[PDB]
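Crash report, auto-generated. Payload:
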Amino acid sequence: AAAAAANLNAVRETMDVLLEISRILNTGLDMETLSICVRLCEQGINPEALSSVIKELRKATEALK
Amino acid sequence: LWEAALTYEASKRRCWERVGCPPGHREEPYLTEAGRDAFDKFCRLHQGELQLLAGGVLQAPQPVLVKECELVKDVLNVLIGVVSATFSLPESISSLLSEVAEYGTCYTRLSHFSLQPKGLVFQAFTSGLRRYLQYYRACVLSTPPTLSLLTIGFLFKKLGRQLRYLAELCGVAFPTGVKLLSYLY
Amino acid sequence: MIHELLLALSGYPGSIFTWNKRSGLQVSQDFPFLHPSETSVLNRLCRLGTDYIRFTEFIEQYTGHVQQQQGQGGLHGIYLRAFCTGLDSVLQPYRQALLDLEQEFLGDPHLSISHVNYFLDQFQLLFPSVMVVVEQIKSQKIHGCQILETVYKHSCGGLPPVRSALEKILAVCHGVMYKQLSAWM
Amino acid sequence: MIHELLLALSGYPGSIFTWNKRSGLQVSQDFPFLHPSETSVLNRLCRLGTDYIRFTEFIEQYTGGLHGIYLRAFCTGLDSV
Amino acid sequence: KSPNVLLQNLCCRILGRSEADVAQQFQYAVRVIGSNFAPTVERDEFLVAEKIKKELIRQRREADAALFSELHRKLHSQGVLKNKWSILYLLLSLSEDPRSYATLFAQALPRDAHST
Amino acid sequence: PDDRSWLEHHVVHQYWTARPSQFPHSLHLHSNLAAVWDQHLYSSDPLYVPDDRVLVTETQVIRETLWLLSGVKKLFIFQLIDGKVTVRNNIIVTHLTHSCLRSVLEQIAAYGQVVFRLQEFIDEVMGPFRTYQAFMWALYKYFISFKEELAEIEKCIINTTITLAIVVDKLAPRLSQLKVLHKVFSTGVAETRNVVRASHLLNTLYKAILEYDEQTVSLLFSLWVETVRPYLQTVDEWIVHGHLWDGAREFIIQRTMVSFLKPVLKQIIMAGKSMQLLKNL
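Recovered output after restart:
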């Protein structure tokens, strides 16, 4: 398939758009993890729950520093 | 799944007739910038032209076979004197085969001239000839591990002519004994 | 078209390159899918192989065909054999060039024609200049030491590679006259 | 279209813009796939490319004619700008 | 995949330690994902786009807000994401400022005059 | 069909073989310029009179022009009027509407005359004056370097994102250098005796080095040394061997004028003949 891979290039293009959005906002997230988050909202999820998850997980790496 | 497939090489060829997001389909190289399938079809097409111009009874050898290195190995076996399946004591492959085949055909007829041990100076002389026959036999399979085929005909051009001159000296009626020893002197 | 060219230029003609004695090597020139861009380059490259075939065939014909001893020195004599002996040693980098081309084409068979033409451009001048020097010897039936002047007048040239190349042959012809000269004095 | 336009700006007049020795690259031709007001926009853009043409001819003729190494230095900086 | 197996890869990206070395924060993740799963306000990316503009004026930059506008247009032009509101609200929640009033601020529809 | 299909795919075969140009374009004005232009032409009601516009792909033309600039000739594009490559008007691509196209290929044609004249001059040597070979040697070496640069660009074409405007700006300092050769060669063919026809050429380069005394001057200098090199050899032979030798005398003194060896010329003659007076002992 050829059109099914140009859509994957399209996914990477929006992923770089969200890369610029992540740096101007100063988030710690990288590209692989945001693709995991994209799949999470494919199944449907509260962003308020994902932010509480990540707002526990990042400042539970500051408790073993 | 996404990130596993994302990592591929993208479009760097750009269309000027499909400016908006070109997927690319490769601007079509030349006939001399294509080969080893277009080579074989190119040969087949010219031979098809030649058979049409003949009527189908022209019949050129080597339509396809064999290789590069294995053909080199059979050629190296002929230089010992071990004849091939084309000689005994594309179509242009047959010509290059003939030019190196006749050298080994000469070497066989020199060793066949020295196979026997009258004439006592002739007995010394024949044994002296085989001391260079061994040197010719030693040069092959010491210099090449296995080289390209054109190096074979090119490297053994300076060696085979020296071999060929002694065939003009030899008969293969003919002097022997003192009659040889004066003629040789 | 790729290997075919090298096989013909080395002196093994096929049918793509119909060997003639008046067009030399000349491509078939009747393909209903040929391109005019490649055509001029094909005709230009054919000239080197034509000169090469004429050179080697002459050398083969007039070196080592006797045991050294007519009365004419336009076809015979030690000086004449020394001429061909020097000419063969000058021809070695052409062989080297073709041998490099096969290796690059085995590495990448999609190389363009201009790359090849670019590499052979140094021989492209060298063969026509040296052609007339042997052509005068054969045509005028030049005998004896008049040979040594003939190359010497053409090694006053203003091309450095041609100058050094003819100088090689004149030194080779010098060896044999020196070899008699060491004995007679 | 703009492959054409970005080389019309490089200096070639074409048959969309008409070169002149009063003011070059004049468009008055109408196209229904272009806006009628677009020409005005185009007109402003034309004023740039004309000067770019008028300079290069100037470099061609020099180096009563004008000669000197100063003419090999004014035209020289005109290249880099 | 499924959410329960998806959270553990988050625990390996954000934390550097394995999911067999720590489970307590993985347990908090399970606890908050289980109990409530569906939003309490309506969605539209238009409103959070106008709020991302409000955040970018707030960090005393003004150029990147015109960057985000062409970027948010590209998000529409491609159209591979099923819910575009959630990830933009999500990046909005994790904002960081390097460097009054908050009871006025533009909010979502309350869903108190709304029944599904 | 089993060979023609394979031919058609991997090799172009659409403007030297009777198969009008095939391209799977998408559409839509940014690159559909020619069809838009045809509809505009129909709306202007000529009535029709079609021209020869073949709608061929783009990069092939660049490959052809670069080959033309490297020195080879006889290609499908670019009709020849008297030995002069001129623009072919029977071809369009999509854009440049055949009018900007007609100008850019004309500029390339004006450069192509200067390469054609030189290649014709070279062909008439391998198909004496005692400086022609020494001059064409340096010319040949120039082409050896220049052709390598151009073939490297073609090597980048086999491996694209290159347009016309990239290579013409890249080749700007070379096509400027080409125009100087139109001026040096013109003094070599403006002519009775073959030694005056030599000095009238070599004096041009001897002046043109002082004209710029950048990057051109190195080319002029390396061309000056290789044409004065026979004269260096001949004057040293006159000095050390006590005699001058050239068949039919390629020199200005007998027993228009170069100023190179002129300020020391009197000390040459006075040294040559006097060395002969040592040979007579």
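Post-recovery validation: The interface with chain F takes residues 32-37, 39-41, 110, 112, 114-115, 117-118, 121, 124-125, 128-129, 157-160 of chain C (CB under 8 Å).
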